[PDB]
Amino acid sequence: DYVLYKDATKPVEDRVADLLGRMTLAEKIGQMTQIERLVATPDVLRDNFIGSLLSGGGSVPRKGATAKEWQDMVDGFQKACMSTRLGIPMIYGIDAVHGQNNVYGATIFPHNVGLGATRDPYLVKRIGEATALEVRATGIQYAFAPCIAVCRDPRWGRCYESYSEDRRIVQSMTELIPGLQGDVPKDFTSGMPFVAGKNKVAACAKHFVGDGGTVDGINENNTIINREGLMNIHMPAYKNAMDKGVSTVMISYSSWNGVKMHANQDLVTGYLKDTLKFKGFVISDWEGIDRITTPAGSDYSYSVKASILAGLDMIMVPNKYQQFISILTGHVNGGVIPMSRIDDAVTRILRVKFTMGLFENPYADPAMAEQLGKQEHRDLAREAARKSLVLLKNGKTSTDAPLLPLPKKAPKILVAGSHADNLGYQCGGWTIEWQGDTGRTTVGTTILEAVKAAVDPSTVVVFAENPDAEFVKSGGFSYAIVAVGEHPYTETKGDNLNLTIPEPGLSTVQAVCGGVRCATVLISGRPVVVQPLLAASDALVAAWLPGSEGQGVTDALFGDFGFTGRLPRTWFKSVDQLPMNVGDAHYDPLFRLGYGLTTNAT
């Protein structure tokens, strides 16, 4: 007879209820299990009734794989799943955090902090639209974005993934969600999940609660703040996300006053689910539950109990799914965790799946393959890179002739610096590799290429990564552009207490600037010790981690557009000043939040 859940014309709650009613326990726990493509097999997926798969950073089919290779891999796995007794399609997730970043040729947008500098939530929405198209070009339906942490200490390895230290700004940027998922209906009820269909992806409001508030900005550490601070600083954005229909919510590795978020039922079930009435699914972070214990995974049985009772719906295992499934099966058999908990979890996961239309379109559209790196997206990244720049100084003394914007026609110029021609540096973490990488890792334009693409043909362009002072003084150059900065980093690799840029960086700037007037382009993921760099330069621009399209940078240096970005964070005088955010008592910044010089297009 008739199977209501397979009927695409039925209400999503009816289909969910129908399916749920036919699921054995193995099938239920299988849905709540997310595993890494690296441990996946058509059998594993089929036998274990696996409910979701993910690519961790750098987890790809082959280096330089095309978009159909991605689609082919995704479809392959999908086929195993569609071949279960219930044929419940799996959902494939990936960190498409500044474009479809793990994918070769994907358009790499400016990282978040640089996006905060734009104060343009519409442009952020447009990036989210572009991003969804580029993710769907590879056959993926779920992006682990946006990271709406409110970084309160830039020593935190992930501060670049936070739009601003000011939640008002982060709240404004949640426009990334309808960008990726498409806008919610007028009929829409906050907390309800939504995805417009196949050319859109399920989004994810990440690191549920207080990740950007850790002590000393130590990653995955503890957030010591009262409940009024939590809700006034770290909660706000999550509610906007609910009114925006964010599909999923990922839980943070961090602790709130000593309690792990992965084991916190008050905030996950009582608050996020009961109070905010979120109806999508709550997913753990990579080994998020193993981590509730110290040592991590020291009592995995406890991990499972703790996180499932707390409220998490889907578990990003991502490797030892055997152990996870065995254990959870055991806790239910022993009544330790009740079927209602399980059913609620599976209820949330199917709702998202049914809603986004996964049951109607579980495979990739070969037609979307050309979306990856589409030139129009690239033109958009270029826009956002340019808009995210913050001119910090444009002249050594109030009476100097402002250096920017530079003339395009000059007899000869120098482009110098470790970051002048390094695509991987320019893009930062979460790019091709998990930690990012160095060199020409993908398709794009470095500050050198962009400079050559900009200047008058009569303009001779000289590149020297690290020129000595005499080299510059004898070069008869009209001016120089020096690019220096941080190296790519992700997560704990980024936790940094000294916040000074690696050398040669200052020495090259001083070398070049001592000999010729220079515009310093600082590529960083955060505020870094800058008074020395400021001391040597005629003009200095904070480019943040601008992405693959370097022309956005020279679109401003050369006057094609004027500078408009403004600090999305406080620029500190020193690290012993930290934390120190707007509204503080010892507020004594080198540059206050909102700071930024302007110029006019030529």
Ligand X SMILES: *[C@@H]1O[C@H](CO)[C@@H](O[C@@H]2O[C@H](CO)[C@@H](O[C@@H]3O[C@H](CO[C@H]4O[C@H](CO)[C@@H](O[C@H]5O[C@H](CO)[C@@H](O)[C@H](O)[C@H]5NC(C)=O)[C@H](O)[C@@H]4O)[C@@H](O)[C@H](O)[C@@H]3O)[C@H](O)[C@H]2NC(C)=O)[C@H](O[C@@H]2O[C@@H](C)[C@@H](O)[C@@H](O)[C@@H]2O)[C@H]1NC(C)=O
Measured in degrees and rounded to the nearest 5, phi and psi for residue 103 equal -85, 125
Q: Which amino acid is at 214?
A: T
Q: Segment near ligand NAG (CB under 6 A), from 213-221, 226-234, 279-287, 345-353? A: 213-221
What residues contact 47, with CB distance under 8 A and at least 6 apart? Answer: none
Site string for ligand NAG, 219-238 (x = CB under 6 A): -xxx----------------
- 277: closest CA among 318, 249, 315, 314? 249
Q: Indicate whether 11 belongs to the interface with ligand X (CB under 6 A).
A: no
Q: Segment near ligand NAG (CB under 6 A), from 192-200, 217-225, 236-244, 346-354? A: 217-225
- Nearer to ligand NAG among residue 30 and residue 217 (C-beta): 217
Longest dimension (CA), the chain: 87
SS3 state of residue 25: helix
With CB under 6 A as the contact rule, the residue among 24, 438, 574, 602 that binds ligand X is: 438
545-561 burial string, b = 16+ CB within 10 Å, else e?
A: bbbbbbbbbbbbbbbbb
| Of residues 254-273, those binding ligand NAG (CB under 6 A) | 255
With CB cut-offs between 5 and 8 Å by kind, which of ligand X, ligand NAG, none does residue 496 bind? Answer: ligand X
Cβ at position 212, least distance to ligand X in Å = 19
Measured in degrees and rounded to the nearest 5, phi and psi for residue 249 equal -140, 125
Place of tokens 């090259």: 508
- Give the span between the Cα atoms of 438 and 285, in whole angstroms: 27
Q: Residue 177 in contact with residue 239, Cβ under 8 Å?
A: no
- Give the span between the Cα atoms of 129 and 371, in whole angstroms: 11
Cβ at position 211, least distance to ligand NAG in Å = 12
- Give the span between the Cα atoms of 595 and 578, in whole angstroms: 18
- Nearer to ligand X among residue 41 and residue 438 (C-beta): 438
- Give the span between the Cα atoms of 227 and 447, in whole angstroms: 45
With CB cut-offs between 5 and 8 Å by kind, which of ligand NAG, ligand X, none does residue 255 bind? Answer: ligand NAG
3-state secondary structure 192-206: CCCCCCCCCCECEEE
- Nearer to ligand NAG among residue 259 and residue 309 (C-beta): 259
With CB cut-offs between 5 and 8 Å by kind, which of ligand X, ligand NAG, none does residue 222 bind? Answer: ligand NAG
With CB under 6 A as the contact rule, the residue among 172, 284, 303, 496 that binds ligand X is: 496
Q: Indicate whether 83 belongs to the interface with ligand X (CB under 6 A).
A: no
- Give the span between the Cα atoms of 170 and 121, in whole angstroms: 10
Q: Indicate whether 590 belongs to the interface with ligand NAG (CB under 6 A).
A: no
Q: Give the number of residues written for the chain.
A: 602
Residue 495 CA, chain-centre distance (Å), reads 17
The answer, yes or no, to whether the previous bond of 568 is cis (omega within 30 of 0) is no
- Nearer to ligand X among residue 113 and residue 539 (C-beta): 113
Q: Which helix (H) or strand (E) holds 557?
A: helix 551-557
Q: Segment near ligand X (CB under 6 A), from 33-41, 121-129, 496-504, 584-592? A: 496-504
With CB cut-offs between 5 and 8 Å by kind, which of ligand NAG, ligand X, none does residue 573 bind? Answer: none
The 10 Å Cβ neighbour count of residue 258 is: 8
- Nearer to ligand X among residue 207 and residue 419 (C-beta): 419
Q: Of 120, 161, 285, 433, which is the active-site residue?
A: 285
Q: Residue 444 in contact with residue 431, Cβ under 8 Å?
A: no
Q: Indicate whether 218 belongs to the interface with ligand NAG (CB under 6 A).
A: yes
Q: Indicate whether 576 belongs to the interface with ligand X (CB under 6 A).
A: no
- Nearer to ligand NAG among residue 222 and residue 264 (C-beta): 222
Q: Indicate whether 422 belongs to the interface with ligand NAG (CB under 6 A).
A: no
Annotated catalytic residue 266: no
- Give the span between the Cα atoms of 11 and 514, in whole angstroms: 70
Tokens of 541: 């621009």
Cβ at position 288, least distance to ligand NAG in Å = 13
Q: Indicate whether 496 belongs to the interface with ligand NAG (CB under 6 A).
A: no
- Nearer to ligand X among residue 240 and residue 418 (C-beta): 418
What residues contact 543, with CB distance under 8 A and at least 6 apart? Answer: 114, 385, 388, 389, 521, 522, 523, 524, 553
DSSP conformational letter for 211: G
Where are any strands of DSSP class E within 37-171?
Answer: 52-55, 91-94, 142-143
- Give the span between the Cα atoms of 282 and 312, in whole angstroms: 5
Q: Segment near ligand X (CB under 6 A), from 298-306, 389-397, 492-500, 509-517? A: 492-500
- Nearer to ligand NAG among residue 218 and residue 534 (C-beta): 218
Q: Indicate whether 303 belongs to the interface with ligand NAG (CB under 6 A).
A: no
Q: Indicate whether 531 belongs to the interface with ligand X (CB under 6 A).
A: no
Tokens of 113: 């902090």
- Nearer to ligand X among residue 107 and residue 496 (C-beta): 496
Q: Segment near ligand X (CB under 6 A), from 302-310, 324-332, 488-496, 542-550? A: 488-496
Cβ at position 218, least distance to ligand NAG in Å = 5
Q: Indicate whether 111 belongs to the interface with ligand X (CB under 6 A).
A: no
Residues near ligand NAG (CB under 6 A), total: 5
Annotated catalytic residue 360: no
- Give the span between the Cα atoms of 587 and 558, in whole angstroms: 35
Q: Segment near ligand NAG (CB under 6 A), from 26-34, 153-161, 188-196, 216-224? A: 216-224
User: Which residues of the shown chain bind ligand X in the complex (CB under 6 A)?
Assistant: 438, 487, 489, 493, 496, 498, 500, 502-503
User: Which residues of the shown chain bind ligand NAG in the complex (CB under 6 A)?
Assistant: 218, 220-222, 255
- Which sequence positions are flagged as catalytic? 285, 491
